[PDB]
Design a protein around this nucleic acid. Structure first.
Ligand SMILES: Cc1cn([C@H]2C[C@H](O)[C@@H](COP(=O)(O)NP(=O)(O)OP(=O)(O)O)O2)c(=O)[nH]c1=O
Ligand SMILES: [Mn+2]
Ligand SMILES: [Mn+2]
Length: 423
DNA sequence: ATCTCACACT
DNA sequence: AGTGTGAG
């Protein structure tokens, strides 16, 4: 019943904000945000401290408008190189945190600031080492048990009541107990998070459950600077009022279609349907996935992959800034290829691998789709001038304009991506 | 006028 | 190999 693994998800709190607060002490414990391309309406916000969220500041907001909502908002700007945002500082801090997490167990890098952890073997080790010894609440100073307490008005008071109920109810005698395994997982995650904060300064949240989807959902339940354990038995109560769209992979069109076709709102309602009924509407794979997921069962593995499988660089050119001349297209392809060259040379030196295929993608003014065209070619020698020339070669036939010097329709996006790594 | 990543089809 | 989808 989806209890074969113990999986955690560790996600950093306001990651880019914490990076900037580490760098600049003036930003600590203040409402602040990270910004991009300041000239247009003060820049687009990409990260927001929890103090700023209390005022209603959100990501994707223009900085000028956030300043309208939060006049004391402090701002840190993403580095800009070659006319575009440069995330090196955050990638390096991410690597720092991934390296600390890698000492405890195999991790799967799920984004710049979160990784999944398969803790099964660590749990087995810690249960044989920790033979029948009771687990003290002191080992879980920041852990919430979702669904408890049940059956007095402060947040931490409730947390402690729930943790006491949890440890009181389940015994260490049977070491195949899923709930005990989850609890040992949570102890390990407390240790991991303490190590991360000690060695980097960054605080983070985590979810501990039996699979990746529940771990991700749990992590968000008690942000920030806390962790949440979602037990198998907690799933029905958790899911009974949990919107479908909150579940990983159901936040888009498929989730909307599940809501529309089945006439439900919450994840638990999926349980009433048989597997073959769900496979009828959503296909064998989606039907079986929904059928298992709504009961708290998921098998997607924590992949042993800390490093990205591709290295890409994209820039949009919206509205009047769209690229309309051949000279413009070649210059921006060069800029993208130069950043790509830097990141690729560093990647080969750090990670002992080389990309062998270059993917070029563009968008044309008018196309509603994010990408209009994607093509490929050989990738050799990590040379920005060569890569940019090859990209121009592979897209040049897309220029409708009869005049060679002009490009039409204007380009609203450029994308270079290195793929197909070899040792 | 909000950029990277993954993977499932075909 | 190219498109659509989901996410963070
Ligand atoms: C959704 C999104 C996130 N990010 C960055 C901002 C975050 O710093 C980083 C981590 O994603 P997140 O964990 O979902 N958000 P957060 O890390 O800022 O904060 P928290 O984990 O919710 O506390 O991803 C983007 O750069 N473009 C985006 O569209
Ligand atoms: Mn985060
Ligand atoms: Mn994240």
């Amino acid at each position: 019943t989806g209890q074969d693994r113990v999986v955690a998800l560790v996600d950093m709190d306001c990651f880019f904000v914490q990076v900037e607060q580490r760098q600049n002490p003036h930003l600590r414990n203040k409402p602040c945000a990270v910004v991009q391309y300041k000239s247009w309406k003060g820049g687009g916000i990409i990260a927001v401290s929890y103090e700023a969220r209390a005022f209603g500041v959100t990501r994707s907001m223009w900085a000028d408008d956030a300043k309208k909502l939060c006049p004391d908002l402090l701002l840190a700007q993403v580095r800009e190189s070659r006319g575009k945002a440069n995330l090196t500082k955050y990638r390096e801090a991410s690597v720092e945190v991934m390296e600390i997490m890698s000492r405890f167990a195999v991790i799967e890098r799920a984004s710049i600031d979160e990784a999944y952890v398969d803790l099964t073997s660590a749990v087995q080790e810690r249960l044989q080492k920790l033979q029948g010894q009771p687990i003290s609440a002191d080992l879980l100073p920041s852990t919430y048990i979702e669904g408890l307490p049940q059956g007095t008005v402060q947040k931490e008071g409730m947390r402690k009541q729930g943790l006491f109920q949890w440890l009181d109810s389940l015994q260490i005698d049977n070491l195949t107990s899923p709930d005990l395994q989850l609890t040992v997982g949570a102890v390990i995650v407390e240790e991991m998070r303490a190590a991360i904060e000690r060695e980097t300064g960054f605080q983070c949240s985590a979810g501990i459950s039996h699979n990746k989807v529940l771990a991700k959902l749990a992590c968000g339940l008690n942000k920030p600077n806390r962790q949440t354990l979602v037990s198998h038995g907690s799933v029905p109560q958790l899911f009974s009022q949990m919107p479908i769209r909150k579940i990983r992979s159901l936040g888009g069109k498929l989730g909307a279609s599940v809501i529309e076709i089945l006439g439900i709102e919450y994840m638990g309602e999926l349980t009433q349907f048989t597997e073959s009924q769900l496979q009828s509407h959503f296909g064998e794979k989606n039907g079986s996935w929904l059928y298992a997921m709504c009961r708290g069962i998921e098998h997607d593995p924590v992949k042993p992959r800390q490093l990205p499988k591709t290295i890409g660089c994209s820039k949009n050119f919206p509205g009047k800034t769209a690229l309309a001349t051949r000279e413009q297209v070649q210059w921006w392809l060069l800029q993208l290829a130069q950043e790509l060259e830097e990141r690729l040379t560093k990647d080969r030196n750090d990670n002992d691998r080389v990309a062998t295929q270059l993917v070029v993608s563009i968008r044309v003014q008018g196309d509603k789709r994010l990408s209009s065209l994607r093509r490929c070619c050989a990738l050799t020698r990590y040379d920005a001038h060569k890569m940019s020339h090859d990209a121009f070669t592979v897209i040049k036939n897309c220029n409708t304009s009869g005049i060679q010097t002009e490009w039409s329709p204007p380009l609203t996006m450029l994308f270079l991506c290195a793929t197909k790594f070899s040792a």
